[PDB]
Enzyme design. Sequence first.
Site, PDB file in Angstrom:
ATOM      1  N   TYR A 149     -51.086  25.031  28.273  1.00  8.18           N
ATOM      2  CA  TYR A 149     -50.511  24.652  26.992  1.00  8.18           C
ATOM      3  C   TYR A 149     -49.928  25.812  26.198  1.00  8.18           C
ATOM      4  O   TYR A 149     -49.239  25.590  25.206  1.00  8.18           O
ATOM      5  CB  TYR A 149     -51.517  23.869  26.148  1.00  8.18           C
ATOM      6  CG  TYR A 149     -51.673  22.445  26.639  1.00  8.18           C
ATOM      7  CD1 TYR A 149     -52.280  22.175  27.861  1.00  8.18           C
ATOM      8  CD2 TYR A 149     -51.171  21.371  25.906  1.00  8.18           C
ATOM      9  CE1 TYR A 149     -52.382  20.872  28.344  1.00  8.18           C
ATOM     10  CE2 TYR A 149     -51.271  20.061  26.381  1.00  8.18           C
ATOM     11  CZ  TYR A 149     -51.876  19.821  27.599  1.00  8.18           C
ATOM     12  OH  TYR A 149     -51.970  18.530  28.072  1.00  8.18           O
ATOM     13  N   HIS A 202     -51.633   6.132  14.305  1.00 12.62           N
ATOM     14  CA  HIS A 202     -51.206   6.318  15.689  1.00 12.62           C
ATOM     15  C   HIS A 202     -49.911   5.532  15.923  1.00 12.62           C
ATOM     16  O   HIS A 202     -49.819   4.337  15.597  1.00 12.62           O
ATOM     17  CB  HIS A 202     -52.327   5.828  16.609  1.00 12.62           C
ATOM     18  CG  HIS A 202     -52.125   6.156  18.052  1.00 12.62           C
ATOM     19  ND1 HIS A 202     -53.041   6.869  18.796  1.00 12.62           N
ATOM     20  CD2 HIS A 202     -51.124   5.817  18.898  1.00 12.62           C
ATOM     21  CE1 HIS A 202     -52.614   6.943  20.048  1.00 12.62           C
ATOM     22  NE2 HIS A 202     -51.455   6.314  20.136  1.00 12.62           N
ATOM     23  N   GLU A 234     -61.056  11.564  19.449  1.00 10.56           N
ATOM     24  CA  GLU A 234     -60.323  10.592  18.658  1.00 10.56           C
ATOM     25  C   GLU A 234     -61.182   9.376  18.316  1.00 10.56           C
ATOM     26  O   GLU A 234     -61.058   8.813  17.221  1.00 10.56           O
ATOM     27  CB  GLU A 234     -59.058  10.183  19.400  1.00 10.56           C
ATOM     28  CG  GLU A 234     -58.232   9.091  18.726  1.00 10.56           C
ATOM     29  CD  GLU A 234     -56.929   8.891  19.467  1.00 10.56           C
ATOM     30  OE1 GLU A 234     -55.980   9.656  19.184  1.00 10.56           O
ATOM     31  OE2 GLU A 234     -56.863   8.000  20.351  1.00 10.56           O
ATOM     32  N   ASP A 274     -43.562   9.542  19.440  1.00 12.49           N
ATOM     33  CA  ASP A 274     -43.136   9.826  20.817  1.00 12.49           C
ATOM     34  C   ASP A 274     -41.887   8.978  21.033  1.00 12.49           C
ATOM     35  O   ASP A 274     -41.988   7.779  21.280  1.00 12.49           O
ATOM     36  CB  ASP A 274     -44.210   9.429  21.838  1.00 12.49           C
ATOM     37  CG  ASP A 274     -43.840   9.854  23.252  1.00 12.49           C
ATOM     38  OD1 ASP A 274     -42.635   9.843  23.566  1.00 12.49           O
ATOM     39  OD2 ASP A 274     -44.743  10.192  24.045  1.00 12.49           O
ATOM     40  N   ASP A 295     -51.822  18.744  17.535  1.00 16.58           N
ATOM     41  CA  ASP A 295     -51.598  18.968  18.960  1.00 16.58           C
ATOM     42  C   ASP A 295     -50.452  19.983  19.063  1.00 16.58           C
ATOM     43  O   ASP A 295     -49.529  19.988  18.238  1.00 16.58           O
ATOM     44  CB  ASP A 295     -51.167  17.667  19.664  1.00 16.58           C
ATOM     45  CG  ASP A 295     -52.308  16.682  19.833  1.00 16.58           C
ATOM     46  OD1 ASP A 295     -53.462  17.124  19.912  1.00 16.58           O
ATOM     47  OD2 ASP A 295     -52.026  15.461  19.901  1.00 16.58           O
ATOM     48  N   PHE A 352     -54.561  24.542  19.269  1.00 17.34           N
ATOM     49  CA  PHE A 352     -55.243  25.097  20.420  1.00 17.34           C
ATOM     50  C   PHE A 352     -54.229  25.163  21.543  1.00 17.34           C
ATOM     51  O   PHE A 352     -53.439  24.236  21.739  1.00 17.34           O
ATOM     52  CB  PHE A 352     -56.429  24.217  20.818  1.00 17.34           C
ATOM     53  CG  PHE A 352     -57.567  24.284  19.845  1.00 17.34           C
ATOM     54  CD1 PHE A 352     -57.516  23.593  18.639  1.00 17.34           C
ATOM     55  CD2 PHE A 352     -58.657  25.107  20.092  1.00 17.34           C
ATOM     56  CE1 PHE A 352     -58.534  23.729  17.694  1.00 17.34           C
ATOM     57  CE2 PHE A 352     -59.678  25.246  19.152  1.00 17.34           C
ATOM     58  CZ  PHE A 352     -59.610  24.555  17.952  1.00 17.34           C
ATOM     59  N   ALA A 353     -54.218  26.280  22.263  1.00 18.75           N
ATOM     60  CA  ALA A 353     -53.305  26.437  23.391  1.00 18.75           C
ATOM     61  C   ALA A 353     -54.102  27.073  24.525  1.00 18.75           C
ATOM     62  O   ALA A 353     -54.182  28.306  24.664  1.00 18.75           O
ATOM     63  CB  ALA A 353     -52.123  27.300  23.011  1.00 18.75           C
TER      64      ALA A 353
HETATM   65  C1  LIG Z   1     -50.314  -0.494  23.791  1.00 20.55           C
HETATM   66  C2  LIG Z   1     -49.229   0.560  23.781  1.00 20.55           C
HETATM   67  C3  LIG Z   1     -49.692   2.004  23.340  1.00 20.55           C
HETATM   68  C4  LIG Z   1     -48.769   3.282  23.660  1.00 20.55           C
HETATM   69  C5  LIG Z   1     -49.401   4.675  23.228  1.00 20.55           C
HETATM   70  C6  LIG Z   1     -50.710   5.035  23.959  1.00 20.55           C
HETATM   71  O1  LIG Z   1     -50.953   6.372  23.439  1.00 20.55           O
HETATM   72  C7  LIG Z   1     -52.240   6.847  23.828  1.00 20.55           C
HETATM   73  O2  LIG Z   1     -53.225   6.137  23.065  1.00 20.55           O
HETATM   74  C8  LIG Z   1     -54.565   6.523  23.411  1.00 20.55           C
HETATM   75  C9  LIG Z   1     -55.509   5.595  22.671  1.00 20.55           C
HETATM   76  O3  LIG Z   1     -55.376   4.259  23.124  1.00 20.55           O
HETATM   77  C10 LIG Z   1     -54.779   7.986  23.059  1.00 20.55           C
HETATM   78  O4  LIG Z   1     -54.558   8.191  21.662  1.00 20.55           O
HETATM   79  C11 LIG Z   1     -53.777   8.821  23.855  1.00 20.55           C
HETATM   80  O5  LIG Z   1     -53.911  10.186  23.500  1.00 20.55           O
HETATM   81  C12 LIG Z   1     -52.344   8.343  23.565  1.00 20.55           C
HETATM   82  O6  LIG Z   1     -51.411   9.022  24.429  1.00 20.55           O
HETATM   83  C13 LIG Z   1     -50.770  10.146  23.890  1.00 20.55           C
HETATM   84  O7  LIG Z   1     -49.951   9.830  22.753  1.00 20.55           O
HETATM   85  C14 LIG Z   1     -48.838   8.943  23.033  1.00 20.55           C
HETATM   86  C15 LIG Z   1     -48.124   8.694  21.713  1.00 20.55           C
HETATM   87  C16 LIG Z   1     -47.920   9.567  24.091  1.00 20.55           C
HETATM   88  O8  LIG Z   1     -47.326  10.756  23.590  1.00 20.55           O
HETATM   89  C17 LIG Z   1     -48.749   9.875  25.334  1.00 20.55           C
HETATM   90  O9  LIG Z   1     -47.927  10.467  26.331  1.00 20.55           O
HETATM   91  C18 LIG Z   1     -49.914  10.805  24.979  1.00 20.55           C
HETATM   92  O10 LIG Z   1     -50.714  11.026  26.132  1.00 20.55           O
HETATM   93  O1  UDP Z   2     -55.791  22.550  29.034  1.00 20.20           O
HETATM   94  C1  UDP Z   2     -55.655  22.071  27.906  1.00 20.20           C
HETATM   95  C2  UDP Z   2     -55.819  20.559  27.491  1.00 20.20           C
HETATM   96  C3  UDP Z   2     -55.579  20.298  26.017  1.00 20.20           C
HETATM   97  N1  UDP Z   2     -55.239  21.310  25.089  1.00 20.20           N
HETATM   98  C4  UDP Z   2     -55.020  20.982  23.647  1.00 20.20           C
HETATM   99  O2  UDP Z   2     -55.523  19.664  23.365  1.00 20.20           O
HETATM  100  C5  UDP Z   2     -54.507  18.857  22.714  1.00 20.20           C
HETATM  101  C6  UDP Z   2     -54.688  17.392  23.168  1.00 20.20           C
HETATM  102  O3  UDP Z   2     -54.201  17.248  24.493  1.00 20.20           O
HETATM  103  P1  UDP Z   2     -52.948  16.513  25.111  1.00 20.20           P
HETATM  104  O4  UDP Z   2     -51.739  16.992  24.383  1.00 20.20           O
HETATM  105  O5  UDP Z   2     -52.983  16.745  26.591  1.00 20.20           O
HETATM  106  O6  UDP Z   2     -53.320  15.034  24.663  1.00 20.20           O
HETATM  107  P2  UDP Z   2     -52.468  13.679  24.653  1.00 20.20           P
HETATM  108  O7  UDP Z   2     -51.534  13.811  23.336  1.00 20.20           O
HETATM  109  O8  UDP Z   2     -51.492  13.581  25.767  1.00 20.20           O
HETATM  110  O9  UDP Z   2     -53.525  12.652  24.512  1.00 20.20           O
HETATM  111  C7  UDP Z   2     -53.195  19.494  23.149  1.00 20.20           C
HETATM  112  O10 UDP Z   2     -52.182  19.301  22.160  1.00 20.20           O
HETATM  113  C8  UDP Z   2     -53.552  20.982  23.167  1.00 20.20           C
HETATM  114  O11 UDP Z   2     -53.440  21.585  21.898  1.00 20.20           O
HETATM  115  C9  UDP Z   2     -55.101  22.647  25.500  1.00 20.20           C
HETATM  116  O12 UDP Z   2     -54.803  23.544  24.699  1.00 20.20           O
HETATM  117  N2  UDP Z   2     -55.311  22.946  26.850  1.00 20.20           N
HETATM  118 HG    HG Z   3     -56.130  19.695  16.432  1.00 23.08          HG
HETATM  119 MN    MN Z   4     -50.593  15.877  22.821  1.00 23.73          MN
END
Ligand SMILES: CCCCCCO[C@@H]1O[C@H](CO)[C@H](O)[C@H](O)[C@H]1O[C@@H]1O[C@@H](C)[C@@H](O)[C@@H](O)[C@@H]1O
Ligand code: UDP
Ligand code: HG
Ligand code: MN
Length: 264
Positions: A64, A152, A222, A245, A130, A59-60
């Site tokens: 995005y 994760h 999630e 990451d 994503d 999705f974009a």
């Molecule tokens: C305790 C240390 C954990 C570090 C990663 C946290 O990641 C985020 O986890 C939450 C759930 O607790 C969600 O899954 C969220 O989307 C995660 O963040 C995203 O993914 C991570 C890997 C990083 O790329 C973030 O910048 C994203 O926003």
């Molecule tokens: O305005 C928006 C917000 C989210 N997304 C989609 O939703 C996914 C999840 O969002 P994001 O990457 O911001 O999540 P994070 O990994 O930081 O939790 C992204 O990869 C995109 O594909 C999008 O297309 N437009």
């Molecule tokens: Hg997806």
């Molecule tokens: Mn993402």
Amino acid sequence: MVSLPRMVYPQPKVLTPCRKDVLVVTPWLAPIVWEGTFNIDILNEQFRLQNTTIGLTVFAIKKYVAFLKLFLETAEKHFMVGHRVHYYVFTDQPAAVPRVTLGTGRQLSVLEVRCERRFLSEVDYLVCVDVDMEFRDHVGVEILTPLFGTLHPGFYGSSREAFTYERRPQSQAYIPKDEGDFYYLGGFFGGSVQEVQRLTRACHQAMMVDQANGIEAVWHDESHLNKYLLRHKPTKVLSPEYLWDQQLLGWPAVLRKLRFTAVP
Ligand SMILES: CCCCCCO[C@@H]1O[C@H](CO)[C@H](O)[C@H](O)[C@H]1O[C@@H]1O[C@@H](C)[C@@H](O)[C@@H](O)[C@@H]1O
Ligand SMILES: O=c1ccn([C@@H]2O[C@H](COP(=O)(O)OP(=O)(O)O)[C@@H](O)[C@H]2O)c(=O)[nH]1
Ligand SMILES: [Hg+2]
Ligand SMILES: [Mn+2]
Ligand SMILES: [Hg+2]
Ligand SMILES: [Hg+2]
Ligand SMILES: [Hg+2]
Ligand SMILES: [Hg+2]
């Protein structure tokens, strides 16, 4: 299905573990996919002999769309190379989708958004990810199976009590502290078309029930994905090599490859 042809490769060693540092199979006997567990030549043969087609959905929306170029260009170098691939880009800006050059047997469809049976006739497996990401290494048929989730990267070494599952019993996504196998990512899941549609349908229905009761799960889709995979065990689990990451987590010894990573 049809017989594999003669192949020359190292003999599997019954008395030598693939890994002494990580779990490579779940309690329900699903493999956990790490580098050093599979022979890609054997798997490529098995899946090519079935003329497998893989759908990759992203999705974009809004800003995005800027991530599409790198996402698609790197997918061309690393995602299911050699196999039939159909990209599905759901976007609110069709005219902003970059013109990316694709290898033979690969196609892209732009679907404008604010069908179901379409996927059933066009692909064998669906992979949902994503878009603010880039592929850096091989992501291939080793991941294909009826239903898979991905560990994760921030919680693979965490105890279940520390997982950020939804903890309020009022939510359909509720998981108590004494339950849970792993913490799966909302950003990388997939399986056969039938299983992916079952999962998305279940999460949509659960989210509607929560909305009606005035509650939103702590990590939205999630949280629901985690509840679904707790009750419907995945047939393969992908290691964090599949969604990492590096800025946030570095490059740990347990990761021999960083395959698909977050874009800064
Ligand atoms: C305790 C240390 C954990 C570090 C990663 C946290 O990641 C985020 O986890 C939450 C759930 O607790 C969600 O899954 C969220 O989307 C995660 O963040 C995203 O993914 C991570 C890997 C990083 O790329 C973030 O910048 C994203 O926003
Ligand atoms: O305005 C928006 C917000 C989210 N997304 C989609 O939703 C996914 C999840 O969002 P994001 O990457 O911001 O999540 P994070 O990994 O930081 O939790 C992204 O990869 C995109 O594909 C999008 O297309 N437009
Ligand atoms: Hg997806
Ligand atoms: Mn993402
Ligand atoms: Hg091995
Ligand atoms: Hg999908
Ligand atoms: Hg949902
Ligand atoms: Hg879901």
